[PDB]
Design a protein around this ligand. Sequence first.
Ligand code: HEM
Ligand SMILES: COc1ccccc1O
Length: 403
Amino acid sequence: ERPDLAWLDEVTMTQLERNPYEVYERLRAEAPLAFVPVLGSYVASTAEVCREVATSPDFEAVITPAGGRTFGHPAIIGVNGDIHADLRSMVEPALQPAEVDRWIDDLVRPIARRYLERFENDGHAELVAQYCEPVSVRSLGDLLGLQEVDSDKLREWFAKLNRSFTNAAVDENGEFANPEGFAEGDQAKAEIRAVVDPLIDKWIEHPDDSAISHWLHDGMPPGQTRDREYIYPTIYVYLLGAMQEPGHGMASTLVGLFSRPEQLEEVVDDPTLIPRAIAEGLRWTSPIWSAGARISTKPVTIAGVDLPAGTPVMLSYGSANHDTGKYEAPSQYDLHRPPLPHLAFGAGNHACAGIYFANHVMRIALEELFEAIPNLERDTREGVEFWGWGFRGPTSLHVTWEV
Ligand code: HEM
Ligand SMILES: COc1ccccc1O
């Protein structure tokens, strides 16, 4: 529709998944709020527009079309008002900083050690599959009450949910271009139900200290539980992003550090720098890159565009975190970048509920890795490819070390 952006008509979904930076660098300059035809939605690409939409009283939560097809209702990311307040009150207790501090070390450190012990003497590893993803999913899985679900299975589920959630391509008429791409998400949800329904059955009668047990029972009248259909979409929210993103973040941090070998050495020598390294990693490749959306509740003007009420806007936080209005050479990883705010955890009422937990999982995991393999080196015989528009991270991370 917008004449000077007619080039956007030729942007493909594959291009956004493999490398969205070049298109989004153009958007941040030409149209910070732009309608992207293949996504069928306005997209916010700069830090100012993302922050404004995410915090505006004239926007509220919505799920993208493919996200809604994947999760249904009421997913915590896509609801408002009394339902959202209830779901936030449901998930927040185990995520409270003072609560996390009581058990996070005893949770993650033995998990990290267990996975490291399988390969720390090999001289070679593929860290995404052998370390980052397993530690991420085993940590949260145990917190949730899914101790009996293998990390292989948790990893398969978040991968299938990822592909379904981000199956966003639409054709001329706004219809999904890849309707068969939701089937593996449906297959994952069916498997999840088969595993989790018996656990919910027993937690209803025998509550325990698992997070999902508390989701059923906390704040409810005596002898009542939240209905499982009411909580399952938020379970899916966790089994996608909460399972995937800490692993994405630590892997992207490592890739960034490998790109700056002097900085990798610094961090290995001084592990108190790991939190700073992770924060730059999340800015540099944001795990939740463009998954979330908001919808306008009244006519509103954003970046010079007059949006009617009812207009969805996708929040491309991963682009916002390369805003050259804020950062110098954002495409480069730099441990010594001056600490500034970033949007990798979103903003506003629907900002990430698990920041403190997530940052601790990534920090402990990197601590234990650099302890066990101080001479870690990137396998330069291999290249690192990143994949994902909605959720983005490296697809593998081959490393080596002298044994
Ligand atoms: C490095 C890892 C993570 C990153 C980068 C991340 C990022 C985000 C982002 C960007 C949002 C969306 C905010 C928006 O649309 O404005 C979000 C939402 C959320 N995240 Fe995190 N997340 C991470 C890990 C986790 C973990 C481990 C948990 C749970 C233990 C978690 C729980 C949640 C919840 C419940 C929401 C929805 C909040 C709401 O809609 O009210 N996140 N996260
Ligand atoms: C925390 O997990 C999510 C965040 C945004 C979209 C999908 C998710 O699973």
